[PDB]
Amino acid sequence: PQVTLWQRPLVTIKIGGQLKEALLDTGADDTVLEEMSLPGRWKPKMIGGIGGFIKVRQYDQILIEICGHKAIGTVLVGPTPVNVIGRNLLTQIGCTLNF
Amino acid sequence: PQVTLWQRPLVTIKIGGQLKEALLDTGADDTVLEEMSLPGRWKPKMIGGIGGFIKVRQYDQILIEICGHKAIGTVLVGPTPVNVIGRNLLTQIGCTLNF
Ligand SMILES: O=C(Nc1nccs1)c1cccc(CN2C(=O)N(Cc3cccc(C(=O)Nc4nccs4)c3)[C@H](Cc3ccccc3)[C@H](O)[C@@H](O)[C@H]2Cc2ccccc2)c1
Structure with a gap:
């Protein structure tokens, strides 16, 4: 939406x-x-x-549902203070930026 | 766009x-x-x-033209590795996310 x-x-x-x-x-x-x-x-x-930098673990080929859409891909887990969905999955759920 | x-x-x-x-x-x-x-x-x-955290300098009410659209806002300069325009300016430019 x-x-x-x-x-x-x-x-x-x-x-x-x-x-x-x-x-x-x-x-x-x-x-x-x-x-x-x-x-x-x-x-x-x-x-x-x-x-600076943080070390994380990389899992690949995990299913995530973001709103109602499913997508599979690589997810890093690690010491972030917020959960971030980056462009790798954003592209799968068809998200655009508009102005 | x-x-x-x-x-x-x-x-x-x-x-x-x-x-x-x-x-x-x-x-x-x-x-x-x-x-x-x-x-x-x-x-x-x-x-x-x-x-982590970075020490930065807050300048208020700087004019920026962002893709030619103008905005006036606080911009922080400092040791970022990439230049980031964030939600405080994005809203002035009328930027929206769609999925
Ligand atoms: O793929 C990544 N890295 C890779 N490296 C090699 C291969 S892949 C990667 C993935 C996710 C995030 C990032 C790193 N990342 C961040 O560190 N920040 C902190 C940020 C950036 C800009 C402003 C603020 C801000 O306003 N902070 C405030 N603090 C107090 C008041 S406001 C915070 C936020 C996300 C965030 C918000 C709040 C808290 C913590 C984080 C941005 O929104 C992200 O896009 C991105 C920006 C960025 C990208 C590349 C280099 C430098 C910075 C990198």
Whole structure:
């Protein structure tokens, strides 16, 4: 649906059978979520942001439902203070930016 | 225009009579710019990111032209690695997310 930016653009996600809210984040290449137990194997990796870098675990091929749409892809879990949905999944749910 | 998110959503800005590219960033509450020269009064301020916190300088009521649209707002300059325009300017430019 359409969202204005007077408030942070927060949605519900279900991931790993857990419900969370998350930020839709156009500045973010990748999705990164607070620490969480997902099933499966994961590769260690690192991402940079404002402030510097953090090490995260990368899980691939996980199902997430963001609003009502499902999408599969790579999700980083790690020490972020907010759950962010980056452009990798944003593209799958058909999200555009408009002005 | 409408932007899809297969690429970083980069826009040209003119600020302080300098030309820069910046990312349109829905997850950023504030706009923050790499170190560059602005005239006038600033204040210290600290922001949070993934990775950590950075010490930044708050300048108020700077005019920015963002994709040619004008806005006047607080911009933070400082050690970001990428120039970010955040929700405080995005709302003035009339920017919306659609899915
Ligand atoms: O893919 C990624 N990294 C990779 N590296 C290598 C390969 S992939 C990646 C994925 C998600 C996020 C980011 C890193 N990231 C952030 O650090 N911030 C902090 C931010 C940015 C701008 C402003 C604020 C802000 O207003 N903070 C405030 N503090 C106090 C008041 S306001 C905060 C927020 C998200 C956020 C909001 C609140 C709290 C914490 C974070 C942005 O919205 C994100 O797009 C992005 C911006 C960015 C992108 C690249 C380099 C530097 C910065 C990177």
